[PDB]
């Protein structure tokens, strides 16, 4: 839950930045359901073996 | 950190300009690691600028 | 089984620091977020922070940002409870319990999932 | 003092039903489904009751219950027994990450 600064850089102008951070400190992901991607990876096989 | 598994970010401090062009102030930002580079040839670890 | 426990009844004068110690008993002290509450004696409970052991980071209540700052050793499975300046309306009963499961994703922080309470202590101050 | 308003007494007999209204707003009831209440016997430490709206732990009965409606979820006791005559206090996620009490809700069973 990060949050946003306001930095002032010269006149008419403004440099943004994470200020602090809420909560507890944690990870980013990608989450891929599982056996739709092995389903999906071994279809490629099939199309991918004849010019192999 | 005793590898804490979650990347923390690195809390940084520098100067920026006020409303007058003249008068500086202290601020701080959290950024990104691999946005920040170490400056010295040294083993310094207190020194950092931006990878741009 | 596991069991949490505390440092029991305490004795101090108005205005002194106390440093009140928890105690992890049968379980993994790295795996569970930790919940401070407060209870004045007789009267509802009121909320006072966490602490993350594997990580350290910990959170202290608006009322008591500043003041709050909570503690970990886990070569002695102690977590612990700084309070300074105190005031004597701090009297009451501090509470540590078990609270959500940790992990790397997901936050489980600001559950109230309270599973185990500590037996307490009440402060002595007037 | 709570944030979250809640009633201090409902009293009555063994048998009976309830409900106990733990209120809050968009910001803490509102917008979450955090919303828990805990048993707390007369100079007994707190016990668990009702967690995530209405979830039970184990040594917990069918006896009790509790569902959400918008800025108001409430707890429903029903098979009210003496031996449960205790206090019980709502709680619930507050937005940033803070936790929040409510009520001084006594039971009593003659």
């Known amino acids: 839950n990060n949050t946003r600064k306001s930095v002032r850089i010269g006149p008419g102008q403004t440099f943004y930045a994470t200020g602090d951070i809420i909560g507890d400190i944690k990870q980013a992901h990608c989450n891929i359901s599982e056996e739709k991607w092995n389903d999906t990876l071994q279809k490629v096989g099939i199309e991918l073996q004849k010019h192999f | 950190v005793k590898n804490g598994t979650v990347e923390e970010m690195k809390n940084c401090s520098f100067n920026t300009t006020t409303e007058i062009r003249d008068k500086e102030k202290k601020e701080y930002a959290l950024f990104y690691k691999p946005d920040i580079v170490p400056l010295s040839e040294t083993n310094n670890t207190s020194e950092y600028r931006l990878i741009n | 089984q596991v069991q949490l426990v505390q440092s029991g009844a305490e004795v101090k004068k108005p205005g002194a620091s106390v440093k009140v110690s928890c105690k992890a008993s049968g379980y993994t002290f790295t795996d569970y977020y930790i919940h401070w509450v407060r209870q004045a004696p007789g009267q509802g409970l009121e909320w006072m922070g966490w602490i993350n052991p594997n990580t350290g980071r910990t959170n202290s209540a608006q009322k008591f940002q500043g003041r709050v700052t909570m503690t970990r050793d886990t070569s002695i499975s102690t977590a612990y409870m700084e309070l300074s300046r105190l005031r004597s309306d701090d009297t009451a009963v501090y509470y540590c319990?078990?609270?959500?499961?940790?992990?790397?994703?997901?936050?489980?922080?600001?559950?109230?999932?309270?599973?185990?309470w500590g037996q307490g202590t009440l402060v002595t101050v007037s | 003092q709570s944030a979250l308003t809640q009633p201090a007494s409902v009293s009555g007999s063994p048998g009976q039903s309830i409900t106990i209204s733990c209120t809050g707003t968009?910001?803490?009831?509102?917008?979450?489904?955090?919303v828990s209440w805990y048993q707390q016997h007369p100079g007994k430490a707190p016990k668990l009751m009702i967690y995530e709206v209405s979830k039970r732990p184990s040594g917990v009965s069918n006896r009790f219950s509790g569902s959400k409606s918008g800025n108001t979820a409430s707890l429903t006791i029903s098979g009210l027994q003496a031996e449960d005559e205790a206090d019980y206090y709502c709680?619930?996620?507050?937005?940033?990450?803070?936790?929040?009490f409510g009520g001084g809700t006594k039971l009593t069973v003659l």
């Open positions: 709680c619930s996620y507050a937005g940033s990450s803070t936790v929040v």
């Open positions: 968009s910001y803490d009831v509102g917008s979450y489904n955090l």
């Open positions: 319990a078990r609270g959500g499961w940790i992990g790397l994703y997901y936050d489980s922080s600001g559950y109230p999932n309270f599973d185990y």
